[PDB]
Amino acid sequence: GKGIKKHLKRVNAPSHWMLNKMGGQYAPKTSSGPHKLLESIPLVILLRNRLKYALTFDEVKMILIQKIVKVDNKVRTDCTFPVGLMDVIHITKSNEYFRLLYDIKGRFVPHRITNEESKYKLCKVKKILLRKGRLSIAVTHDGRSIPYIHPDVKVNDTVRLDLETGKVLEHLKFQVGSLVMVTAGHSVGRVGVISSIDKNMGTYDIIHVKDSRNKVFATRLSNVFVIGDNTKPYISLPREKGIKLDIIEERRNRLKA
Amino acid sequence: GSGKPSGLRAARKLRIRRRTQRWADKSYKKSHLGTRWKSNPFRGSSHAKGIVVEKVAIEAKQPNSAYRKCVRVQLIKNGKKITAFVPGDGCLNFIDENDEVLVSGFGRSGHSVGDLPGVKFKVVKVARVSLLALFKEKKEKPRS
Amino acid sequence: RMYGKGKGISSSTLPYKRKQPSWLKQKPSEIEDAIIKLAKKGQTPSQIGATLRDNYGIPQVKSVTGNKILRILRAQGIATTIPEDLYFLIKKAVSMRKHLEKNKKDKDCKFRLILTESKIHRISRYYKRKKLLPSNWKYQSSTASALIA
């Protein structure tokens, strides 16, 4: 007939799933949801390939059936629910809290995290709609609509967003020296300060992001996620702290162990 | 001067001349003309199956003196009549006057081979038994 | 040579010193006036230059006057609509055509006429590319004769 595609082939699966070529013909195909399949990750992968709590899809399903895994604090029983960049996972029985982050490679790690910090999540606004009764609503990368957002919030900036209640805490403008994480090409794990934004007329607004080794790298503004003010990040970053080393340096590090 | 243009923006001429000239290469022409499929018994194939029509002798090229034993066969595929030389010291009689022969090329694409005038084909199986096998004889015997 | 097999190199070649020589008494204004007079009298650029060189004591109008002679003519406003060389070519062509009309069997002449036409078309094209000719100017074998004047 011809409509949408329900299946995903295991080689056509996006690399940072890190699936096998063997070990299956297909991949899980993230449900539609709050994240873009190419930059998400289904819950199945998390449960089975990352934490390794499950050996199989079946086990994951079973786990889900006990209403014990929460993603952003409300439960999910959909095995192929997409988790995505910043989202806190609360596996209830272990009393583990994870937050998904990026590695210095493209790969999702589940970070491990405290009760206290778990209660919020960072969310970058994308669009800021006006709706009926001249009320503004931000729309986050979490595919979530924040209504009655504080007026000073502008199109690219992140927002520290509470989970227990839908309301926001604080917001961090997209400034010239704002601690930033990346979430797309090459420099994906990378975490920097920002030197400069280009602001091209018709095109993508390219930005340059100085690291803490002072290695500058550029990136589209699209795929940059504000994470702090110049001093401190508002989230716990992984062990590497977004310092994508050179290849040689990495090898040296590996050797020294 | 070279003959060819060596301009930076010359590429069109360079390509075009090559495209026209390729066709002077005999081998290239053989490969890329459409008359290959038309004017060839095997019709672009390794072998072909033909029932035999006539066990026949062919006198060799002048210097050498033999009557080479050929088999004029009709391809089932194509309805084409072709002479196919039969190898072996005494392997004309190993085939019947009507036998489903499997005939290959002689080794030189179309081009004819050795002493033989214009026989471009080598029968290499009769009634599904291998001519070579029959010749050896220790291996096999013609089933009928 | 553009058309023959001629390969000669007979040429004017000017001297190294291009600030006018000591012995040249003529002030520029006078020379300009003289040039103007020559132009009025019917002479063409090249011819004018030649006259200046020979009859008056002056090698090159470019060394006495900052400007070349065509430029000064233009400034004074007595420049031809139709450039020197081109005009000459046209004249030649016209002459050839008359001969052809008179005398139909001349093959060599015809061949040479074609060559001159071609050269005109080159020259003509060049002038069009600048702004000496107007873009509306083909050269016509029918008109040609009238054009020269």
Partner: protein
């Protein structure tokens, strides 16, 4: 007619070297040609040369040290990327240890090694051994 002054000049130089001249009158000087000559001088292959100014395209006369094996232009000044260089040099010049493959590069004309050091490849003028 002339097209590439530089090429002609280089050919002349080569001829002179072959004969075993000493002096040689490169007949239309060009900024590019001058630059090339300077480069050559720097890497030892050529001696002094007295770019004589006429009031036209100048003449150079150039002093030769009997040292050049060949020098040449490679017409079609192929744009050449920095990665593409190595293969080109392999193709051209007799040894990796010596000879020079001169590029015009947005940082002036310089040899392949120089280009590599810099980072920019550019259009490829010529070479010597």
């Amino acid at each position: 007619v002339r097209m590439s002054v530089l090429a002609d000049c280089l050919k002349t130089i080569n001829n002179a070297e072959k004969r075993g001249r000493r002096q040689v009158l490169i007949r239309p000087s060009s900024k590019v040609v001058i630059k090339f000559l300077q480069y050559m001088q720097k890497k030892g292959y050529i001696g002094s040369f007295e770019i004589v100014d006429d009031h036209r395209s100048g003449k150079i006369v150039v002093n030769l040290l009997g040292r050049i094996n060949k020098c040449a232009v490679i017409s079609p000044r192929y744009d050449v990327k920095l990665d593409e260089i190595e293969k080109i040099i392999t193709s051209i010049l007799p040894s990796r240890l010596f000879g020079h493959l001169i590029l015009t590069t947005p940082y002036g004309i310089m040899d392949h090694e120089e280009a590599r050091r810099k980072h920019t490849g550019g259009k490829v003028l010529g070479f010597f051994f």
